[PDB]
């Protein structure tokens, strides 16, 4: 009960972190868990409609916060709903340029190393490398 | 780096064609402008009363001091000097001040005939470090350029550790961006124009 | 007969071509569309980069183009823009901080910066008074490098605002950016000092809201529209046509932008 | 550090066990100094072999000099912070 | 049933000062490189 109450206050802005740090996707994951969104949506159903709407809106804004400011400015120019596709296309274009620049095997090792730091799932990394390779030809 | 990130990092070399020429040329434009402001205005023009070259003056000085060689006598640092020695010191001091302002740096003669006060000695020692260091830097960059290694400095970092040690990805990415551009770019001026 | 001045600052050719097609198809040829690098009125600037001749960089949340996520939000983000010199020349925002370290005199540059901040402060307080807010939020990057430009910015912005009778709250860049993206209803008027990070924050806010057109106030006196994406540029053109005295055309462009952001030209 | 361990081992052998190191032991030390690039320790070991033993393997002496030449030309003969000019009030006493 | 955890509490991001290789190029740029490291640490502490 306390965790959900704390999370609701945190998203609403009533409750601040110890060091007044920004409430991004990364910050929440380190305390409330990776799936903080899942345990919050179910809890919100036990609240009036107004609170439910606020929780949904705050969750959506937090997800948009998962990108850096530079990425948002470059890719979120034409709305947030189209942000994900635009960001994916730009990343794919970078992959194509990398492949055309320094071969494929190095790109394969590069993507694998990037997936390590990215915490990317192997399936997602494999899908990305296949997509960029297909885009090349 | 907590949480699954949206995108993978790729070298931010989108404008990889940062032609070394242009970067150096822009550096030249920046450097000259600041130097002009710091100094101020070009000093008012001066017309020479007599025409003579520095080489001719040096040759005349050597000829004048060459005849008076037997006449010269070893004098200790703590003994009164000879008229000959006084003339030699003055002439060489002026000549080597001119040469140090021109660019020729014979750090032995400039030491003997220009260094009197300990402050002067400190300034000379600083100059010797700068001249030799700049020179050896060019040699390092020369071999570096022949190898194709990035002209700019590269820090000794292990980014795989960096992502691991952080809790948010935004600052980590930015650091890669900054140091990637630093190494990607060149940091040298067109000294021909700087000296001019 | 009439003229619309298109400025390009770091914009891809695709966006500029899209803007030219939109104006030509909507206007119908009555108003010509000329391209330049500086203007004071009837001007649309395409691209993230700041054009030459703009001192204020205000942006708001238009009611018509509010994204469903950000419905009802009302906050005005004004970025102060110092005079822009040639790309090769050292910019004032950097000269004001590096010359002091090098010992060079910084009197004229300080005077120019002071004038720019005063104009930006006057714009910010006017917006705050119009909206009725009592306190504004100054944004200054807390990096050690920018320990002089921000100091002057705070010294002047607070002086002008306090003279006007409103309150000022100073904050950094990361905290304000997170608040503006997550909880923007708690900020009424936010001024931003002239830094690259602030420019990115302004663009991110203009895009996250759903795509809007920024307003630039120039030295000559006036307002010019600014966009960076297909939707933002389309809204910028629609506002510009409205200023020229075209209501139906402006509404059509706005409707097309709302419906089909990336392909407004074909949509309308 | 391999060199430190071997020197300590020799110290134990000569002092706390009363055994004189032979040529073989010193040669191993010299090889480690050459392999590790520590060209200054090689000079000291070179004299030690020339003093206690009968000279040094000329192969290793030349190699050690070669190591010195490399950083003699690379601007890494002395750590730079040491060579920085300092002053009475320009030194940071941690 | 005692206290479990302060979800509000967050471990501060422990900064690390960037270290440059000791070459002649570093000595010439010692002041400039040091400024970059200070800026990097300031960015890490504040966040951006």
TrEMBL record, chain A:
<dbReference type="GO" id="GO:0020023">
    <property type="term" value="C:kinetoplast"/>
</dbReference>
<protein>
    <submittedName>
        <fullName>Uncharacterized protein</fullName>
    </submittedName>
</protein>
<dbReference type="GO" id="GO:0005739">
    <property type="term" value="C:mitochondrion"/>
</dbReference>
UniProtKB/TrEMBL annotation, chain B:
<protein>
    <submittedName>
        <fullName>Uncharacterized protein</fullName>
    </submittedName>
</protein>
<dbReference type="GO" id="GO:0005739">
    <property type="term" value="C:mitochondrion"/>
</dbReference>
<dbReference type="GO" id="GO:0031966">
    <property type="term" value="C:mitochondrial membrane"/>
</dbReference>
TrEMBL record, chain C:
<protein>
    <submittedName>
        <fullName>Uncharacterized protein</fullName>
    </submittedName>
</protein>
TrEMBL record, chain E:
<comment type="similarity">
    <text>Belongs to the ATPase delta chain family.</text>
</comment>
<protein>
    <submittedName>
        <fullName>Uncharacterized protein</fullName>
    </submittedName>
</protein>
């Amino acid at each position: 009960s306390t965790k959900m109450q704390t999370l609701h206050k945190l998203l609403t802005g009533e409750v601040s972190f110890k060091n007044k740090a920004p409430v991004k996707d990364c910050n929440i994951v380190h305390q409330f868990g990776e799936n903080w969104a899942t345990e919050l949506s179910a809890y919100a159903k036990t609240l009036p409609a107004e609170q439910q709407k606020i929780i949904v809106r705050q969750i959506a804004r937090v997800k948009l916060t998962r990108y850096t400011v530079a990425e948002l400015a470059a890719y979120c120019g034409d709305g947030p709903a189209l942000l994900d596709e635009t960001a994916r296309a730009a990343n794919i274009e970078q992959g194509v340029a990398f492949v055309k620049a320094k071969g494929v095997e190095a790109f394969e090792k590069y993507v694998a190393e990037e997936s390590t730091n990215a915490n990317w799932k192997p399936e997602e990394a494999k899908k990305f490398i296949e997509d960029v390779k297909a885009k090349a030809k | 780096i907590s949480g699954v990130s949206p995108l993978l990092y790729f070298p931010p070399t989108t404008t990889s064609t940062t032609n070394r020429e242009d970067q150096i040329n822009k550096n030249t434009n920046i450097a000259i402008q600041m130097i002009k402001r710091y100094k101020g205005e070009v000093p008012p023009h001066y017309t020479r009363k007599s025409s003579a070259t520095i080489e001719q003056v040096e040759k005349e000085i050597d000829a004048l001091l060459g005849g008076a060689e037997k006449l010269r006598k070893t004098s200790t640092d703590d003994q009164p000097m000879d008229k000959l020695t006084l003339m030699e010191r003055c002439l060489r001091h002026a000549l080597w001040s001119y040469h140090k302002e021109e660019g020729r740096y014979d750090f032995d003669q400039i030491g003997r005939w220009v260094v009197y006060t300990p402050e002067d000695e400190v300034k000379l020692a600083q100059l010797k470090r700068e001249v030799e260091a700049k020179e050896k830097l060019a040699a390092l960059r020369k071999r570096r350029e022949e190898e194709g290694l990035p002209g700019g400095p590269v820090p000794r970092i292990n980014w795989p550790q960096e992502y691991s040690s952080f809790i948010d990805r935004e600052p980590v990415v930015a650091k890669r961006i900054r140091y990637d551009t630093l190494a990607s770019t060149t940091l040298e001026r067109d000294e021909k124009q700087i000296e001019s | 007969s009439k003229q619309l001045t298109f400025i390009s600052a770091g914009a891809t050719a695709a966006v500029l071509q899209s803007a030219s097609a939109i104006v030509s198809k909507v206007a119908g040829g009555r108003v010509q569309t000329k391209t330049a690098k500086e203007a004071g009125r009837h001007a649309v600037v395409v691209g993230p980069e700041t054009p030459i001749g703009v001192h204020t960089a205000v942006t708001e949340v238009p009611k018509s183009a509010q994204d469903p996520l950000f419905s009802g939000v009302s906050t005005v983000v004004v970025r102060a823009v110092l005079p822009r010199a040639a790309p090769d020349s050292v910019q004032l925002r950097d000269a004001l901080d590096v010359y002091a370290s090098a010992g060079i005199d910084t009197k004229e540059e300080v005077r120019s910066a002071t004038e720019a901040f005063k104009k930006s402060a006057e714009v910010a307080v006017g917006k705050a008074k119009a909206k009725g807010v009592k306190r504004i939020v100054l944004v200054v990057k807390q990096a050690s490098k920018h320990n002089c430009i921000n100091e002057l910015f705070k010294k002047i912005s607070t002086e002008t605002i306090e003279s006007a009778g409103l309150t000022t709250e100073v904050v950094g860049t990361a905290a304000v950016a997170n608040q503006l993206i997550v909880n923007p209803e708690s900020l009424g008027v936010v001024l931003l000092n002239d830094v690259a990070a602030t420019e990115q924050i302004e663009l991110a806010f203009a895009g996250v809201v759903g795509g809007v057109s920024r307003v630039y106030h120039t030295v000559e006196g006036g307002k010019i529209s600014a966009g960076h994406s297909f939707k933002s540029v389309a809204l910028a053109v629609a506002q510009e046509l409205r200023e020229l005295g075209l209501s139906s055309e402006a509404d059509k462009v706005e409707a097309a932008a709302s419906k089909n952001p990336r392909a407004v030209v074909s949509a309308l | 550090s391999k060199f430190c361990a071997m020197m300590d081992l020799l110290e134990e052998m000569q002092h706390r066990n009363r055994l004189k190191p032979n040529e073989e032991s010193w040669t191993w030390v010299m090889k480690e100094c050459v392999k590790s690039g520590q060209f200054r320790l090689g000079y000291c070991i070179q004299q030690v072999m020339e003093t206690e033993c009968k000279g040094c393997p000329a192969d290793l002496v030349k190699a050690n000099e070669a190591n010195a030449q490399k950083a003699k030309t690379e601007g890494k003969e002395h750590p730079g912070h040491l060579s920085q000019q300092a002053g009475l009030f320009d030194v940071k006493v941690e | 049933r005692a206290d479990e955890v302060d979800y509000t509490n967050l471990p501060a991001p422990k900064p690390q000062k960037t270290v440059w290789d000791d070459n002649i190029e570093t000595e010439v740029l010692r002041k400039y490189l040091d400024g970059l490291s200070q800026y990097d640490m300031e960015e890490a502490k504040y966040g951006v």
